[PDB]
Design a protein around this ligand. Structure first.
Ligand SMILES: O[C@@H]1[C@@H](O)[C@@H](O)CO[C@H]1O
Ligand SMILES: O[C@@H]1[C@@H](O)[C@@H](O)CO[C@H]1O
Ligand SMILES: O[C@@H]1[C@@H](O)[C@@H](O)CO[C@H]1O
Ligand SMILES: O[C@@H]1[C@@H](O)[C@@H](O)CO[C@H]1O
Ligand SMILES: O[C@@H]1[C@@H](O)[C@@H](O)CO[C@H]1O
Length: 614
């Protein structure tokens, strides 16, 4: 049964932000009208809380003591006047700056002349204290000066995070940090613990363009980093285009569904003053919001794609035997899409299916569910009352170290970590799985009795997995359950004993595969499909670069495109051959060390061309 309670973790921010509809064309009156429409539409009761003032409020001016100064013709009463107005509505207020010396209003002016000086570098503590003193509850910290100056994102945002924490401690007003560095330098590796949210890609929409489902989907794909998100820390696929001109009701729901399955922030970006009744209702759907804001804090993942473009996404919800599912159709025709219990990490026992847009139960099954999905459309379900797959349970074999952890397959697993935190404040620890990049986990107050928080981790097939915690509360056991829909395999070189690896969890098209010490991370877990693809992160295909057909052709990751250069034969002699070329996956020069490049080469008997893929 349920025997140790699950501790609720903080949800992603919900609210509205000024960028998508106004660009830098903002002032007090713009924000006030949006606040009034937000309130009139009943957004606050649905959970929407933040009113975020984005680029355009500050032209880069400072007084002689280095204090940020604003133009009171645009901001009468100064910035504490607009925070007071927002607060008078029971809402929270957000502000915006840059990590560097000059901001995006300087580097990429959009609706205003360039604003030199519009960044916080050299003033992190001063500016963070200022924002907090003015009354801001949220700050979005952009990267235009960081990118321009050559700054290191990880160390820079750490310094910024420290200043955010000091500012909030001084004023007594909590300050929510949004890291906005567009997925540059792989923020999923380092942002959890520094901030509750971090941008995973470039902008969902550029001022002057129409909302695009293509852009939406690219942002969604780029946000999927399930080991990086947990315990109040979220991947951020960007501000919503819900309700913007050109998006249909169906596209608006699909936007909500995909953000909800990720557990993404819901920061509306439409013009609230002309918002339709239908759009308001789509933003406010409480069942969809409840999935987005799930107490367990986990990120949804792809669990099936039996036919290209016909996809099932699953999310592990709070409690036991509960799942949310999105069925998504990226093809040009309506098709049936099925989700199987086995893929969701449930046993073949009865569960109840509910449609979150119909707001009605639509069937039971002990095996799965199929719905017709329109071209470009999606269906949003929960599957509840199911039976969880059998877990492993483990006790620490040394201080903060769990060893001998078992996975039937390489792939993603849900770990519930038991602990007691009988104090009034959350504590953090560093978690490292095998030799993977470490992550930070937060442990909220439990009272006197133990509770669990959950994390998603990627493990290697077998019983040699380790989970090691440093710092934070003593833990009292872990539970481990697989998500079979995420199953993959290490591709291990016979000669080297090393694994096909994409450096440091990079997702960029054209990154070349290399040998690396096997660690079972997402950047090493390859799913071989019925279409002979070798798929990484659920959405990148092992690819012979530019359909190269000769010795030395680079083997890279690339968006899956159905071509022959992304198809691979796993041969009985241990070779892996590219279909287009007939050449063998090859560890270059028969080197065996970390960083050895993988290429295509004419097949022979050599062991740098031999692999295991189980
Ligand atoms: O990514 C941000 C966008 O969200 C808005 O803040 C304008 O500046 C860009 O750099
Ligand atoms: O964990 C990864 C490892 O697999 C390799 O890609 C080098 O970078 C580390 O972050
Ligand atoms: O179509 C190929 C693609 O598969 C990748 O190899 C990049 O180059 C393109 O020409
Ligand atoms: O034999 C290896 C071959 O497999 C390829 O890696 C190129 O270098 C050669 O020395
Ligand atoms: O980017 C490279 C990566 O490909 C790996 O080989 C280690 O060195 C880094 O500089």
């Amino acid at each position: 049964a349920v025997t140790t309670r699950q501790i609720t973790v903080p949800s992603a921010p919900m609210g509205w932000a000024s960028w998508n509809s106004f660009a830098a064309k903002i002032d007090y009156s713009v924000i006030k009208k949006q606040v009034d429409a937000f309130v009139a539409a009943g957004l606050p009761a649905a959970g929407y809380t933040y009113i975020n003032i984005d680029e355009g409020w500050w032209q880069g001016t400072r007084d002689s003591a280095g204090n940020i100064t604003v133009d009171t013709a645009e901001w009468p009463g100064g910035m504490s006047a607009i925070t007071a107005y927002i607060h008078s509505k029971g809402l929270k207020a957000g502000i915006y700056t840059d990590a560097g010396k000059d901001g995006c209003g300087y580097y990429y002016p959009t609706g205003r002349p360039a604003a030199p000086g519009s960044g916080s570098e050299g003033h992190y503590d001063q500016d963070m204290l200022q924002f907090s003193t003015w009354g801001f509850d949220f700050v979005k910290v952009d990267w235009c000066g960081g990118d321009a100056e050559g700054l290191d994102a990880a160390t820079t945002y750490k310094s910024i995070s420290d200043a955010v924490g000091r500012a909030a401690a001084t004023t007594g007003r909590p300050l929510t940090l949004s890291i906005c560095n567009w997925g540059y330098q792989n923020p999923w590796n380092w942002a959890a613990g520094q901030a509750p949210l971090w941008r995973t890609s470039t902008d969902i929409i550029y001022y002057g363009n129409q909302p695009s489902m293509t852009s939406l989907l690219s942002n969604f794909d780029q946000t999927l980093h399930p080991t990086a998100q947990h315990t109040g820390y979220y991947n951020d696929p960007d501000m919503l285009m819900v309700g913007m001109d050109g998006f249909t009701a169906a596209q608006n729901r699909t936007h909500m569904n995909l953000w909800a399955i990720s557990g993404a922030p819901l920061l509306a970006g439409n013009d609230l003053t002309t918002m339709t009744s239908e759009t308001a209702g789509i933003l406010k759907n409480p069942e969809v919001i409840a999935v987005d804001q799930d107490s367990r804090g986990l990120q949804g993942v792809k669990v099936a794609e039996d036919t290209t473009g016909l996809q099932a996404y699953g999310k592990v919800l709070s409690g036991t035997g509960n799942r949310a599912v999105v069925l998504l159709n990226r093809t040009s025709a309506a098709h049936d899409i099925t989700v199987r219990w086995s893929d969701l990490g449930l046993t073949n026992a009865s569960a109840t299916v509910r449609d979150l847009w119909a707001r009605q139960n639509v069937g039971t099954s002990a095996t799965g569910y199929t719905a017709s999905v329109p071209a470009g459309g999606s269906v949003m379900l929960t599957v509840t009352g199911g039976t969880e797959a059998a877990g492993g349970a483990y006790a620490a074999t040394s201080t903060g170290r769990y060893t001998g952890v078992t996975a039937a397959s390489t792939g993603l697993n849900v770990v519930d970590v038991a602990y007691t935190n009988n104090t009034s404040s959350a504590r953090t620890a560093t978690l490292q799985v095998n030799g993977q990049t470490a992550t930070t986990v937060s442990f909220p107050p439990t009272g006197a009795s133990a509770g669990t928080v959950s994390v998603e981790v990627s493990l290697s097939k077998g019983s040699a997995n380790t989970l090691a915690l440093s710092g934070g509360p003593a833990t009292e056991g872990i539970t481990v359950r697989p998500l079979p829909g995420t199953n993959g395999a290490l591709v291990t070189g016979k000669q080297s004993g090393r694994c096909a690896d994409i450096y440091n969890n990079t997702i960029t098209n054209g990154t070349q595969a290399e040998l690396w010490d096997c660690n079972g991370g997402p950047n090493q877990s390859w799913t071989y499909t019925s279409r002979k693809e070798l798929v990484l992160y659920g959405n990148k295909c092992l690819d012979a670069y530019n359909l190269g057909t000769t010795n030395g052709t680079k083997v890279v990751i690339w968006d899956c495109n159905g071509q022959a250069n992304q198809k691979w034969n796993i041969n009985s002699d241990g070779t892996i051959t590219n279909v287009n070329a007939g050449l063998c996956l090859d560890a270059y020069n028969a080197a065996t060390a970390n960083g050895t490049s993988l290429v295509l080469w004419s097949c022979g008997t050599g062991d740098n061309q031999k692999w295991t893929v189980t």
